[PDB]
Ligand binder design. Structure first.
Ligand SMILES: OC[C@H]1O[C@@H](O[C@H]2[C@H](O)[C@@H](O)[C@@H](O)O[C@@H]2CO)[C@H](O)[C@@H](O)[C@H]1O
Ligand SMILES: OC[C@H]1O[C@@H](O[C@H]2[C@H](O)[C@@H](O)[C@@H](O)O[C@@H]2CO)[C@H](O)[C@@H](O)[C@H]1O
Ligand code: CA
Ligand code: CA
Ligand code: CA
Ligand code: CA
Ligand code: MN
Ligand code: MN
Ligand code: MN
Ligand code: MN
Lengths: 232, 232, 232, 232
């Protein structure tokens, strides 16, 4: 049994376990702000530095993982609250798409909304070009921001949101539980074969994006993670 | 949204929010001890007092719930470490089976291991009459202790174990993530149509049993839970 | 090499290996509760019955030891969390001080905080009379509860704590590593010449104390220990 | 508080968290063999892939760490049981010294026995060129294999050895406890200023070496580690 686990209650620059890409910034209170409020088409991403082996070709086993994180999104004057945050899994060479337009691409896909990642988005802006539902929502993304599945959700400015994700290797089920500020929970599950959509070694992280008129504060507050792969 | 949420960091007798059935006893630190070490075929069950409505006949909706709790099993001299604990959901009128033989029935089924409940078992004893696997295991029980699905597990004496459970209403998926002492996680998931196996209002809880030659300490250390049913 | 070694995963009354002093009591799960919540100025101490020879005037050799154990301090309604636990080493004839006021004396010193022992304290209440730091702390005591050195620490109600202590005869260094619940470790070390502070044979144990208003659950969960004295 | 922790009960090739250098090999039982028995001047090293930040120039704080590991050394016919294993800490660009002669350099130093590392050696061959004591021994190495301090020790072929290391940032004390097969423990402590001997970012690992006539099996069986650096 090969297990990877870490726990972040706050973050600090210089920590060799976290990689910053784009407009990412660490505030004085240890929180991570993903986008820069003064940039058009801002994109910020934070990844756990070490790649995690989610499956072995030698045994054909896929890993199971449990992870929880909390974030906060807050409105700012004049700009439209957009675009959202996405928790993703991508190949180890993952980088911000060249000529990224930000916005509804959430910093992980091209203009068509395509890319190489699996993820869970917290979408706060309805992009008709990517078939977004008409309300804020949570969706499961498999190589595209045109979600494979979505559930109505509500983003509340300033509210701390808690998320718990469980990926069960056997059934290949990815389950998500979002605990809203007011106590109500939102859930969504989708069968995704990680061994067929991603390489043996991947990277986990968070990404957020904005546009010219759509900008908001995107904060990643804490993050704990554990993956366990059977080796037999 | 109809939401039911509670959080116990310790328990105390008298708390009208919990119902004690059988040999249940509360230790000095608020831990609940399920079985009595001096009784033969001991059975102890703790339940949340208020009934939770998991589904509606009018709308046809089913609730989603997120729950985590930590427990502990410890060995006792001269007795085989058995039988184990089960997180269960049953009708509001639920009671310990009449003339229960404890042992492999986990305090939720008859002699055959049949009953009207749904639960996740943490079985430390292999009962061939219930087609138990040859090792410690986690199992999804639907109206019987002859698990619908099981997964190899290892119960460590004196170790505090943490469990997270997410039930998604849309997919009808019950996902279990077990964090063992050493860090490793064990997962199991199964599709269970609650709407078909239980009445609209049910009760949640834990149960554990022992027999003549098989007994061990069974403690529940904490319990948080939140469910949300959509009313539309 | 004279070696003394033991390991208690649980404790049962009557085990001739353990001496109870004061308000000690064993729970049904095998944990030793050190204080009584119903008594004013409560004191309890648990000692390993067979005295251990830490040095010898014949050779001049001092022994080295390695020991680890786990405890749990939990808050109770209406009382201030006080006063903490201490792992101590004392003369073989040691007893709870006459007219023990409990409190900041931790059950091992007089009203002035003086005594004849060497120990590591997990202090959860600040006593200005004994020059206690303003926060919970781990300390190295040498014939006084007015610690020779302290280190900020943080006690978490309900959390299981793990400690490892190493005493090296050649440098005469006493080292401690506290593994908090969340995974962080706290350390503290100090040069304490054991052969100049205690008789050739001493007893090892734990002690806890309460006051009029400060009372809390103090549980010793497990203890393992090894000493080795070179006989040449 | 910045904490790094991992736990290895076995090892497997492909794990992106471990780096192999030299003649390292993973056996079927998950154990790591460091040297190749058919090569003259064999050298094998295994490092935890991610660099650990042991101190911050921003705050001037040093990290505290607790680590335990177990190894086994076994004789083989015809060859002299040599040369030993060394648990070391070195700069992130650490590699096997070019033109390494293996042997008493233990794979971390040049012919003069110099290098850039801090470590704990389990030396099974007396090299007079490096001022080795005449018996097997445990020593603390600071930039050289001519140990700063050593303690007599005995290597027992085939015996599983358990080691526990604690480094306390405040006193800058490095303490080692070696639990031999027969129960006896050996200890050694030395004050080493890590912030004055190493760069902010380092790597932890194990190295073993042999020579033409001196070869033996060197196995690393398990390894757990936790470091915590205060960030304030
Ligand atoms: O208003 C929020 C959305 O903005 C969209 O981009 C805008 C752009 O910000 C604005 O400068 C004007 O050009 O029109 C564009 C298209 O409507 C993003 O594409 C969308 O995702 C939100 O950020
Ligand atoms: O005998 C074990 C030690 O060997 C020393 O090197 C030897 C070499 O193996 C042997 O062939 C002899 O000819 O010459 C060398 C010098 O004695 C190593 O130097 C020492 O580290 C041990 O492994
Ligand atoms: Ca969108
Ligand atoms: Ca059974
Ligand atoms: Ca005090
Ligand atoms: Ca040598
Ligand atoms: Mn979307
Ligand atoms: Mn079973
Ligand atoms: Mn104190
Ligand atoms: Mn040496």
């Amino acid at each position: 049994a090969e297990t990877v686990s870490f726990n972040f209650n706050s973050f600090s620059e210089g920590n060799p376990a976290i990689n910053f890409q784009g407009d990412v910034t660490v505030l004085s209170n240890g929180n991570i702000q993903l986008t820069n409020l003064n940039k058009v088409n801002s994109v910020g991403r934070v990844l756990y530095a070490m790649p995690v082996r989610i499956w072995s070709s030698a045994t054909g086993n896929v890993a199971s993982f449990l992870t929880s994180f909390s974030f906060e999104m807050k409105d700012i004057k004049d700009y439209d609250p957009a675009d959202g945050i996405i928790f993703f899994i991508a190949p180890e060479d993952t980088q911000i798409p060249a000529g990224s337009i930000g916005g509804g691409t959430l910093g992980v896909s091209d203009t068509k909304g395509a890319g190489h990642f699996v993820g869970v988005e917290f979408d706060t802006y309805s992009n008709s070009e990517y078939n977004d539902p008409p309300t804020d929502h949570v969706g499961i993304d498999v190589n595209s921001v045109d979600s494979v599945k979505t559930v109505p959700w509500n983003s509340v400015s300033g509210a701390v949101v808690k998320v718990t994700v469980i990926y069960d290797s056997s059934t290949k089920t990815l389950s998500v539980a979002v605990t809203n500020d007011n106590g109500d929970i939102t859930t969504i599950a989708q069968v995704v074969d990680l061994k067929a959509k991603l390489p043996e070694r991947v990277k986990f992280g968070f990404s957020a994006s904005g546009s010219l008129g759509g900008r908001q504060i995107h904060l990643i507050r804490s993050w704990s993670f554990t993956s366990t792969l059977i080796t037999t």
